[PDB]
Design an enzyme around this catalytic site. Structure first.
Site, PDB file in Angstrom:
ATOM      1  N   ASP C 227       0.823  -1.200   0.000  1.00  0.00           N
ATOM      2  CA  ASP C 227       0.000   0.000   0.000  1.00  0.00           C
ATOM      3  C   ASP C 227       0.860   1.254   0.000  1.00  0.00           C
ATOM      4  O   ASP C 227       0.446   2.276  -0.528  1.00  0.00           O
ATOM      5  CB  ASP C 227      -0.947   0.018   1.199  1.00  0.00           C
ATOM      6  N   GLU C 270     -18.097  19.291 -14.756  1.00  0.00           N
ATOM      7  CA  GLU C 270     -16.789  18.652 -14.775  1.00  0.00           C
ATOM      8  C   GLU C 270     -16.961  17.143 -14.919  1.00  0.00           C
ATOM      9  O   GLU C 270     -17.987  16.590 -14.528  1.00  0.00           O
ATOM     10  CB  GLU C 270     -15.990  19.006 -13.521  1.00  0.00           C
TER      11      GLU C 270
END
Ligand code: CDL
Ligand code: CDL
Ligand code: CDL
Ligand code: PEE
Ligand code: PEE
Ligand code: PEE
Ligand code: HEM
Ligand code: HEM
Ligand code: HEM
Ligand code: HEM
Ligand code: FES
Lengths: 81, 147, 378, 62, 241, 51, 378, 48
Positions: C227, C270
């Site tokens: 991660d 957007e």
């Protein structure tokens, strides 16, 4: 609850494992690594690509047709005569 | 990289290019005649500046240390006695004193009759403590940073 | 007896992080969920500094933005890491939902539904936040999208005026959105804690879809660094996107100050809301596009009910995979259509793309799930 | 049979984690300066005649 | 009517991924802005500072700020005396208010140039071509005498009169004053006007590319180093039967 | 509190002394670098990009 | 097989609320703790509707509040519920801490410390929030408090200007304070979750001080309605403070605009800070007054160390009880002295009250505790 | 404000007209005086 001490039962399945320092972090990279990635790509390729290829044809058509829809302004005046 | 992150955010809080610009700056000519005053805006505060004659320095130095409502040795105040630089706000209710006025030759407040000596110390009237003296230093002989 | 197992606070860190079992065979996609958390952590703090300078009024807002971009130290980096960080948040989010649609992680139905609620909260958050710049695009984006509420038959306009705080978008509305956009993400964090709370009592799914209790692994030594590699690649994409071409993903002609008197020539939302916009613009009648707008996001709850395959993972079911990537291509179709001015060639493709978008998730998938069930003699 | 440099390096700096973090910090101390002046020298090198600090010659030091 | 012509891309110095703006062009472009532009265009967000680190020296900025008088707050009474000007002052308003600007321009309002580049689609590329291009009007189309035919303008009839021609202004640099060089310097200066942070951003982009290229292989090797125990393991099955 | 002093505790504290000075060096140098402290950094032979 | 025991959310609610054992003999004082939990919600909800109109610019912060109290419908009730609500918050807070000091609840040291940190958080929140209205006392209080930071010997003024965002208190400082004031209470909430987390693995204390395992009882049947009555009385006292005498806990002068130039006479900070302020008035030295100030609140951490009695509650130990009420009377003394101008009578009483405030709990209490030990023959 | 406490709305509309205040700019013009309405605040005696 589901801690490591109590999960699925399993019976005599022996396993083996080296220390990280005892072995290279990049074993046989060229002889085995790259061809593996290539086999993987060859597996995913025909499954994945064609729809995207289909998308592109539509994308090209839509813009092009819209170009005929608008930029061919002269066709309308040409219709006027 | 982490430092270049952390301190960077801290840099956002330290100030601003305009607040740094509006403030501190107040470079001014030393062309001002003795006994003549000129007000100047500074950080929103009025700020009078006045060159003064040596005799006024004498009458100011002559003032007893104990007689003052807000005692403060004069030579200990101003770095160079011939120039005086002060905030333009009176210490009472904030009205701005008239330049070069009053019985003691300093400043006088129209609002309630507060008096001031040439050194700007309170001498008579309702106002408690002396007019504020901003920190500053001379640079070139003709100019002075204010702040 | 390690100190971590005795301390009541450390027990939570011990179970939720250091020692929860995970499938061994987890791939790259499962990183994205964690990335979302990090993105949130980035969307908060970064945005928090913007809050130190932004002034939510109809007049002072835009000038405060110029103040951030210029007079404030390093302010533009903050504004761009923030504005692009949101788009990164939606990239990671769409991929994060997509893996769930693929690997059959939706069978964890409660976690699935909570995730949907996080999705809607994220949409309201980003939407109310886009209004803050108060540029030309923002005033009209909020104007049109809030005009959508006009559609509801009885509540209609009265509801819209209750959101506006007036008869039109103005300063009080901008302050409204400043507060709500300021408060929602912190709700999103708590709901995310609920999300993990319904997730960890069953365990993480694996790409094969087979139960993997035989080969569970402690989360720390491996997935903290995996991660971490994901966080580093994420910062790679974000820092490149902001420090090299900050505005490619942004919209030009937003910078002009808002004119109530004037409507911008193209006016579009957007991109991350934008696919849904087609489902509006394609559908006839003002209300039907609203209901389609609701169903477009709310189907996801309907999806687990529609499951018919006796398996789980998509990887063993290629015929479904073809429909899956077909559907993704359909989503790209919706986005490119929503990026374009109204015309017949676009509207036709929008009709087809919308109807196909619903048929693939309602009709087609279960049937071929059955066919695949019969190909293997079940 | 010659000793590798790492055989002594590990025996000194890396054997204890405190000295390890210490040598890391000193390494950051030098790396910050060196890498920063290096990257600055490069970016200054690509665009000669553009940056104003090089344009200062028309008016600097009287 | 028909959509406006799409401007050609240009081989600009700053369009390189790492290349920076040329400050001499910014200077000469500002020197164009002070005369031909300033008469009828505001720049709300730029002060006489900013220039201090990019082109003009601080002393020269002090000398420049004083060349135009500015409105100031009240002295005795109101009376509102006007100061000679200082560094923190912004560029002067051509008009007291927008309505006057419309009155001076047949109702047209000249847009603020502070963000004119990053606003328009195609960016500054829209601007140069807008200035460089003034074709004589097409046969079969007609328009008001106050209107002027610039094809790159979306309305294809800009109210602006052709702002520049050769030797409208004489550069202090002594460089030739072609209208092309003028428009080029204008677009460069406006580009800086809308992106003050550009030169620093390229610099931090370089430094991040170096640190990132340095870091990715390392972290990846750490991950390989941890996961190697799993990748290398060889489980086996040994039933009693 | 009185119990903590003793014949073996002296030995233990002595065992951890080098670690204590070493982490103290860690905190000191780390603070000097994190703060860009100017005073000591003027004295360091190469770290002088500061003007 | 009840469903509470099955679903994890219902599990946690089954723990924290419905089923956790409590001593049966718990009195009315413990209720205040829960009341604090309530107050925070109010302080959020109410406050959330003040942020929708408030403008954190220095030039308009006051007029915006005039806009709230006048122009906004039902705004004044929100205003006064908020302002008086903070006062009730600190009243319940002081009573809560006094309860914890009296019954020997400080022995739960981790919970105690989390309570202290949460205390400092609430204090900073109340301070910045009191700075928000931007009146005379607000602006002046900010200047006076902020300068104290300047006290620190080396870093001092750079740090103080780093808080101000400028040379002097102004709009950016106001905006910053609006942001931190907005953000802190939710952190106070998460701390509160930690607080209850540490609290519940041992269980709530009882007034006798003896362990109550023999007489534990479920929380839901009894304490929910007991806390319902306590919350009702709380709303009663709060609404009576708001709808009849809104002003008296407040201070006139805030309704005047802030003047950087002019300086207000009495210059008194809002009442909950007053006693601490007296300590600043008490020590002639600047840095000494600052350290005495920080000690005034930190001192609570040292209490468990100073405990000497072989019992918890003071109720069985009357002498220490008398010292306790001497301490309360002393706090009333400081709290009253904070409202007064420096003069001969006040300065002497303030110094004696402060020194007594430190000596009574750093010296007298442990010793009389030892005396109480010897009197009972062990 | 006064409309609900004392004066009826017509009375306030009459009273507001009695005093006048400057308005926004005219086309090719500026700052003309206006009769005033209900939404106007009480007049400010001095410019500053
Ligand atoms: C903006 C968009 C967001 C960012 C990009 C997408 C996110 C990347 C990601 O999270 O997945 C990493 C993931 C890491 O491998 P993994 O952990 O095993 O993932 C499970 C596999 O799907 C396991 O399935 P697989 O074993 O069958 O492998 C699937 C993959 C085969 O590729 C791989 O297995 C790994 C490829 C990475 C090699 C790195 C090359 C140098 C850098 O197939 C393909 O990549 C499709 C062929 C066309 C791409 C050719 C170039 C790839 C290089 O890589 C991928 O699977 C996709 C990479 C393709 C990227 C797009 C290339 C253009 C098309
Ligand atoms: C700041 C002001 C805050 C005032 C406290 C608000 C919350 C009080 C509370 O815990 O709930 C009611 C609570 C119900 O009794 P509880 O649940 O058994 O409380 C534990 C007792 O403290 C257990 O102790 P106790 O059983 O020995 O009884 C204590 C109490 C005995 O009070 C009671 O028995 C309960 C209340 C009945 C009297 C009500 C009088 C009319 C109203 O004795 C006193 O009244 C204190 C002596 C000095 C005041 C004398 C006159 C005040 C009445 O009553 C009190 O705690 C006493 C209230 C004191 C009034 C303020 C006096 C000024 C000093
Ligand atoms: C706002 C968020 C609402 C949802 C809270 C989610 C957190 C709950 C939790 O982690 O359960 C642990 C539980 C794992 O422990 P477990 O072995 O299954 O035993 C459950 C009991 O917690 C084992 O402990 P227990 O048997 O002693 O359970 C009693 C304890 C259980 O309380 C907790 O489990 C922790 C709750 C507070 C977390 C600390 C906050 C730090 C910020 O109850 C309390 O502490 C009183 C309630 C305090 C929370 C009140 C929140 C609303 C006011 O769930 C998880 O798998 C942890 C992942 C959940 C998200 C964590 C990632 C981000 C943090
Ligand atoms: C713990 C692990 C780390 C967590 C914190 C953040 C992680 C850092 C990841 C950064 C990725 C790599 C980018 C680095 C690029 C870089 O720094 O270039 C240098 C340049 C500054 O130096 P120069 O002006 O170029 O010259 C020297 C001036 N002294 O910095 C940049 O331009 C890079 C900009 C990228 C910013 C990314 C930062 C994001 C990290 C978020 C952490 C925020 C925490 C702070 C909040 C405090 C509140 C409690
Ligand atoms: C507009 C631009 C916005 C950018 C957003 C980017 C989202 C687009 C994603 C497209 C990525 C295309 C690359 C696909 C790579 C690929 O084919 O992987 C093959 C691989 C097969 O692997 P196995 O099953 O294990 O088979 C092993 C055989 N031995 O297939 C997969 O990886 C599938 C799992 C990945 C899921 C992620 C899909 C990303 C698409 C997201 C959009 C769909 C979500 C819709 C939800 C919307 C709700 C509002
Ligand atoms: C700051 C303060 C500013 C506030 C302004 C005015 C406040 C005046 C406070 C005076 C209130 C005191 C009245 C209390 C009445 C009372 O306690 O009755 C006696 C009664 C008898 O109890 P038992 O021992 O159980 O009897 C056994 C019989 N079965 O005593 C008690 O119960 C009281 C114990 C609870 C303590 C609550 C006191 C409230 C004030 C405490 C605050 C002091 C700590 C301050 C620390 C703050 C640091 C941040
Ligand atoms: C802020 C938003 C979100 C956050 C912070 C978040 C966080 C997480 C995390 C950390 C995991 C652990 C597994 C992993 O990381 O892959 C997870 C799992 C999961 N999430 Fe999310 N998520 C979010 C949004 C969503 C959405 C929008 C959905 C569905 C539409 C969803 C559904 C799921 C599902 C089904 C799993 C199970 C994966 C497995 O079992 O392996 N989540 N989530
Ligand atoms: C998931 C969480 C969030 C998302 C996706 C998000 C997204 C956005 C977006 C898209 C903008 C528009 C910026 C632009 O277009 O230039 C914005 C602006 C802003 N946001 Fe957020 N935001 C989030 C959380 C927050 C938080 C937690 C805060 C404060 C603590 C915050 C404060 C602000 C402020 C002050 C602005 C205005 C600055 C600007 O418009 O450039 N946001 N946000
Ligand atoms: C424990 C939590 C809180 C406490 C004790 C508290 C206390 C206060 C206090 C004392 C004031 C001064 C008001 C006055 O004296 O007139 C205030 C104002 C204010 N509060 Fe809070 N507050 C808390 C949380 C919050 C929250 C969560 C918000 C969220 C919006 C908030 C928003 C505001 C605003 C905007 C003001 C200034 C507006 C005005 O005064 O008209 N506060 N608060
Ligand atoms: C908003 C502030 C606070 C909230 C919401 C809160 C919450 C709670 C709650 C709900 C309880 C349950 C028992 C009860 O209500 O009596 C409790 C107990 C407790 N609290 Fe608080 N608290 C706060 C502040 C504090 C402070 C400032 C301190 C110490 C200075 C503190 C120390 C304690 C202690 C020691 C207990 C244990 C009770 C016992 O042993 O019986 N708390 N807290
Ligand atoms: S205001 Fe200065 S004397 Fe009255």
């Amino acid at each position: 609850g589901r801690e490591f001490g109590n999960l699925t039962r399993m019976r005599h399945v022996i396993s083996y494992s080296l220390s990280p320092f005892e072995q290279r972090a990049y074993p046989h990279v060229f002889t085995k690594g790259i061809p593996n990635v290539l086999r993987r790509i060859r597996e995913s390729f025909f499954r994945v690509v064609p729809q995207f290829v289909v998308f592109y044809l539509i994308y090209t058509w839509g813009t092009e047709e819209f170009e005929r829809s608008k930029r061919k302004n002269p066709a309308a005046y040409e219709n006027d005569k | 990289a982490a430092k270049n992150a952390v301190t960077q955010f801290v840099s956002s809080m330290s100030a601003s290019a305009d607040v740094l610009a509006l403030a501190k700056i107040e470079i001014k000519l030393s062309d001002i005649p003795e006994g003549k005053n000129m007000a100047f805006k500074w950080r929103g505060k009025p700020l009078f500046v006045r060159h003064r004659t040596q005799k006024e320095i004498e009458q100011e130095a002559a003032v007893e240390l104990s007689q003052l409502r807000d005692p403060q040795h004069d030579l200990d105040r101003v770095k160079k006695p011939e120039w005086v630089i002060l905030i333009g706000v009176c210490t009472h209710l904030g009205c701005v004193p008239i330049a070069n006025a009053g019985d003691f030759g300093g400043y006088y407040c129209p609002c309630h009759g507060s008096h001031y000596d040439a050194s700007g110390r309170i001498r008579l009237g309702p106002a408690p403590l002396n007019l504020e003296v901003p920190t500053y230093e001379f640079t070139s002989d003709d100019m002075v940073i204010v702040g | 007896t390690p100190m971590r197992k005795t301390n009541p606070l450390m027990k939570l860190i011990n179970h939720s992080f250091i020692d929860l079992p995970t499938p061994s065979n987890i791939s790259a996609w499962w990183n994205f969920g964690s990335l979302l958390g990090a993105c949130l952590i980035l969307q908060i703090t970064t945005g928090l500094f913007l809050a130190m300078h932004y002034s939510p009024d109809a007049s002072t807002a835009f000038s405060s933005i110029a103040h951030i971009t210029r007079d404030v130290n390093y302010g533009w980096i903050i504004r761009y890491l923030h504005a692009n960080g949101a788009s990164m948040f939606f990239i990671c989010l769409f991929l994060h939902i997509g893996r769930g649609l693929y690997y059959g992680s939706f069978l964890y139905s409660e976690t699935w539904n909570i995730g949907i609620i996080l999705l809607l909260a994220t949409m309201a958050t980003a939407f109310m936040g886009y209004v803050l710049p108060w540029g030309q695009m923002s005033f009209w984006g909020a104007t049109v999208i809030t005009n959508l509420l006009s559609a509801i038959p009885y509540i209609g306009t009265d509801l819209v005026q209750w959101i506006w705080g007036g008869y039109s978008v103005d300063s009080p509305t901008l302050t409204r959105f400043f507060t709500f956009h300021f408060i929602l993400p912190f709700i999103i964090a708590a709901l995310a804690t609920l999300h993990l709370l319904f997730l960890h009592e069953t365990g993480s799914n694996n790409p094969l879809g087979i139960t993997s209790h035989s080969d569970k692994i402690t989360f720390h030594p491996y997935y903290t660094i995996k991660d971490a590699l994901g966080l580093l690649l994420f910062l790679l994409s974000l820092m490149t996107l902001t420090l090299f071409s900050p505005d490619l993903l942004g919209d030009p002609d937003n910078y002009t100050l808002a004119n109530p008197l004037n409507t911008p020539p193209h006016i579009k939302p957007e991109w991350y809301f934008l696919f849904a916009y087609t489902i509006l613009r394609s559908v006839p009648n003002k209300l039907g596009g609203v209901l389609a707008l609701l169903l477009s996001i709310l189907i996801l709850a309907m999806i687990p009910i529609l499951h018919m395959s006796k398996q789980q993972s998509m990887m063993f079911r290629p015929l479904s995979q073809s429909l899956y990537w077909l559907l993704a291509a359909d989503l790209l179709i919706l986005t490119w259509i929503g990026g374009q001015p109204v015309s017949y060639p676009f509207t036709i493709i929008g009709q087809v793309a919308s109807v196909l978008y619903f048929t693939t998730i309602l009709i087609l998938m279960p049937t071929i799930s059955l066919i695949e069930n019969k190909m293997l003699k079940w | 049979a010659a000793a590798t440099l790492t055989s002594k390096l590990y025996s000194l700096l890396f054997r204890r984690t405190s000295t390890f973090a210490l040598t890391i910090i000193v390494g950051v101390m030098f790396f910050e300066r060196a890498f920063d002046q290096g990257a600055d020298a490069i970016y200054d090198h690509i665009n000669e005649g553009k940056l104003w600090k090089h344009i200062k010659h028309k008016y600097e030091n009287k | 009517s028909d959509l406006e012509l799409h401007p050609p891309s240009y081989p600009w110095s700053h369009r390189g991924l790492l290349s920076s703006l040329d400050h001499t062009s910014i200077r000469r472009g500002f020197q164009v802005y002070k005369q031909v532009c300033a008469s009828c265009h505001s720049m709300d967000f730029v002060a006489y500072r900013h220039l201090v680190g990019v082109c003009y020296t601080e002393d020269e900025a002090k000398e420049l700020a004083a060349e135009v008088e500015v409105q100031d707050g009240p002295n005795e009474d109101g009376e509102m005396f006007m100061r000679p000007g200082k560094l923190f002052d912004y560029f002067p308003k051509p008009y007291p208010n927008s309505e006057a600007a419309r009155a001076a321009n047949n109702g047209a309002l000249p847009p603020d140039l502070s963000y004119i580049v990053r606003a328009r689609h195609g960016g500054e590329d829209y601007v140069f071509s807008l200035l460089t291009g003034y074709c004589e009007p097409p046969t079969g189309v007609s328009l008001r005498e106050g209107l002027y035919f610039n094809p790159y303008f979306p309305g294809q009839a800009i109210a602006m009169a052709p702002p520049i021609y050769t030797d409208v202004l004489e550069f202090d640099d002594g460089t030739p004053a072609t209208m092309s060089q003028i428009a080029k310097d204008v677009c460069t200066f406006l580009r800086w006007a809308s992106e003050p942070e550009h030169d620093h951003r390229k610099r931090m982009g370089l430094k991040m590319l170096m640190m990132m290229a340095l870091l990715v292989p390392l972290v990846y090797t750490i991950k390989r180093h941890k996961w190697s125990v799993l990748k290398s393991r060889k489980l086996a099955y040994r039933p009693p039967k | 509190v009185t119990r903590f002093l003793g014949p073996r505790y002296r030995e233990l504290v002595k065992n951890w002394v080098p670690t204590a000075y070493t982490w103290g060096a860690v905190g000191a140098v780390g603070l000097v670098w994190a703060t860009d402290w100017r005073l000591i950094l003027d004295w360091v032979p190469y770290i002088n990009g500061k003007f």
